[PDB]
Amino acid sequence: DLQAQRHPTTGQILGYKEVLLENTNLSATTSLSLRRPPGPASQSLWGNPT
Amino acid sequence: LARASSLEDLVLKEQWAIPVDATSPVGDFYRLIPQPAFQWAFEPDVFQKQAILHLERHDSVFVAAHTSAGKTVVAEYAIALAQKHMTRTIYTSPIKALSNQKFRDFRNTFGDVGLLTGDVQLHPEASCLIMTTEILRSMLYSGSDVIRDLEWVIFDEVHYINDVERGVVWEEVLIMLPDHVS
Amino acid sequence: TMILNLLRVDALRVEDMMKRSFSEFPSRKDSKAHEQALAELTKRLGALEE
Amino acid sequence: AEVHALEALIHFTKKDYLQAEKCFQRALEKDTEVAEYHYQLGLTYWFMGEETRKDKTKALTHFLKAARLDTYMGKVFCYLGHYYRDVVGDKNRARGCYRKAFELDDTDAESGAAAVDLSVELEDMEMALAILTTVTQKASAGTAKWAWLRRGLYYLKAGQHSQAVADLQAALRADPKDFNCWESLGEAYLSRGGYTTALKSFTKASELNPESIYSVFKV
RNA sequence: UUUUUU
Numbered sequence: 332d333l334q335a336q337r338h339p340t341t342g343q344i345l346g347y348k349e350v351l352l353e354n355t356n357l358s359a360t361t362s363l364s365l366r367r368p369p370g371p372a373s374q375s376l377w378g379n380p381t
Numbered sequence: 382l383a384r385a386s387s388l389e390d391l392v393l394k395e396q397w398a399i400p401v402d403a404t405s406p407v408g409d410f411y412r413l414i415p416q417p418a419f420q421w422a423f424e425p426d427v428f429q430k431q432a433i434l435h436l437e438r439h440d441s442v443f444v445a446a447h448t449s450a451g452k453t454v455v456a457e458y459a460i461a462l463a464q465k466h467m468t469r470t471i472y473t474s475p476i477k478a479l480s481n482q483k484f485r486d487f488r489n490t491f492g493d494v495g496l497l498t499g500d501v502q503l504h505p506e507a508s509c510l511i512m513t514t515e516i517l518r519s520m521l522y523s524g525s526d527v528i529r530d531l532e533w534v535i536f537d538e539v540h541y542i543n544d545v546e547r548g549v550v551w552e553e554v555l556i557m558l559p560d561h562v563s
Numbered sequence: 564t565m566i567l568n569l570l571r572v573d574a575l576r577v578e579d580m581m582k583r584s585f586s587e588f589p590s591r592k593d594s595k596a597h598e599q600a601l602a603e604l605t606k607r608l609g610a611l612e613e
Numbered sequence: 614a615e616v617h618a619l620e621a622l623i624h625f626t627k628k629d630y631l632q633a634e635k636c637f638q639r640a641l642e643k644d645t646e647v648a649e650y651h652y653q654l655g656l657t658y659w660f661m662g663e664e665t666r667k668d669k670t671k672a673l674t675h676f677l678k679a680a681r682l683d684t685y686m687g688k689v690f691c692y693l694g695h696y697y698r699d700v701v702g703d704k705n706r707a708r709g710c711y712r713k714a715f716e717l718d719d720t721d722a723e724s725g726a727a728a729v730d731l732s733v734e735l736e737d738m739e740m741a742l743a744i745l746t747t748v749t750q751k752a753s754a755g756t757a758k759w760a761w762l763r764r765g766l767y768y769l770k771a772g773q774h775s776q777a778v779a780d781l782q783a784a785l786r787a788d789p790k791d792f793n794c795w796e797s798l799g800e801a802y803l804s805r806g807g808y809t810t811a812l813k814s815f816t817k818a819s820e821l822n823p824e825s826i827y828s829v830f831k832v
Numbered sequence: 833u834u835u836u837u838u
Contacts, residue, residue: 335827339734340730340733340734340763341793342766342793342797344827359524363572363574363575365529365559365561365805365806366806369526369808370524370526376497376505376516376520376525376527377516377519377520377523377525377838378519378523378838379523379525380523380571382702382703385678385702386702386703386706388678388681388682389681389697389698389702389703389706389710390703390705390706390709392681392684392694392710392713393694393706393707393708393709393710393712393713394706394709394713412753412754413753413754414754415754415755416754416755416786439779465786466782466810467810467813467814467817468807468810469809469810475836475837476836476837477836477837498837498838499837499838513837513838514837514838515837515838516837516838518838519838522568526808529806529807529808529809530806530807530808530809530810542585544836546836546837547836547837550837550838552584552585553565553580556580556583556584561775561805561806
């Protein structure tokens with residue numbers, strides 16, 4: 332992801348360093364957590380199987 | 382330093398339901414909460430002041446009042462707090478005809494209020510969506526990505542649980558609600 | 564509709580909703596006391612000789 | 614004679630002026646009042662006068678040492694111990710006497726915020742959380758942003774987003790203009806589920822201080 | 833011989 336860095340006090344962007352993502356291989360139709368990708372697209376609010 | 386270093390370092394070393402009293406406690410509503418999220422043209426009564434005192438800490442009230450015009454002060458202070466925090470709030474009414482004038486009054490009182498019902502879908506992107514409970518029950522079974530931004534769910538008339546053909550909706554909703562939603 | 568919307572999902576079973584219903588509250592109110600009494604009274608039977 | 618009064622007035626005049634008079638006031642006070650605790654007031658005045666320009670490795674530093682040996686019971690010598698441990702001289706005992714000077718004389722955020730910040734900069738962390746909790750009960754309505762922000766970030770390092778968001782919300786309710794708090798709160802919402810509240814918060818963060826690239830990029 | 837929601 333190339334995440335930002337933060338000064339330990341009054342956090343300021345020292346530099347951008349790459350780290351490993353951890354909640355990939357997670358999907359909207361096979362996972363029930365608030366970490367999954369948002370959704371297919373703008374979509375019908377209700378009435379959605381799968 | 383050797384002696385001064387030491388001379389400095391030696392000196393250097395369950396109930397689950399709280400029946401808050403109706404009348405007695407509150408005496409000081411303005412010392413704390415000096416910037417209320419909403420300001421009326423009159424004085425909020427004692428029990429409404431206590432309810433606001435507990436809504437500040439993000440607790441979960443159960444108002445049970447007499448007059449229909451006393452509860453909506455809490456019901457719009459929660460929306461003022463929601464707009465202050467940038468989050469979203471869902472006000473849910475059972476009657477299809479009751480959720481029209483409530484919509485009118487909430488759009489007139491402040492900013493953006495979307496409405497969702499069986500046929501109306503005015504602005505389904507606002508921060509005070511007004512719906513019928515069967516629509517919240519239908520978008521709890523799927524994700525619908527609105528649940529990601531909620532703070533408050535204002536069940537308006539929760540004494541319809543005693544109904545014979547719709548009392549199961551209120552309990553399917555009260556069960557499926559995630560934990561971060563007061 | 565309830566049965567369909569819960570069989571569809573894998574990590575949720577239909578008896579969970581039945582357990583959590585208000586009409587089951589009196590039976591399921593002091594449930595933690597029931598399991599603690601069972602798990603610490605099974606110990607007390609674990610005393611007697613065969 | 615006005616011994617204490619005249620010396621104090623001369624020191625005050627020296628403070629109003631440059632540190633030239635300070636050398637005379639310090640020498641006169643040290644020569645005249647030979648003590649350790651009553652002398653500690655003149656020692657602290659001489660160190661406050663000398664700290665402007667003088668290096669004072671022995672004139673004020675030993676004076677501050679005598680004032681530290683004259684540590685008073687109540688709210689009279691903790692700030693001296695804090696200022697004595699500024700940057701050097703066994704920084705671990707410097708952290709110890711910040712902890713002592715803020716544990717005894719916990720009065721205002723100014724001393725309090727610097728004290729807690731320097732405490733948390735050292736390795737130990739599970740002591741800062743208790744301090745933050747203690748300050749948190751005495752937060753009346755806002756007006757404790759120096760505590761709220763640090764405790765929110767400290768809660769942000771762990772995966773405990775509910776309390777962290779609440780803390781940052783309280784901090785902004787205190788004063789809703791520091792863009793750093795808005796950006797950090799937006800990041801807090803984005804760490805957990807919320808997507809449109811993070812967007813709204815980041816837009817608000819960028820609208821004021823429109824110089825910040827990170828906020829617009831995140832938007 | 834009234835009332836109600838996807």
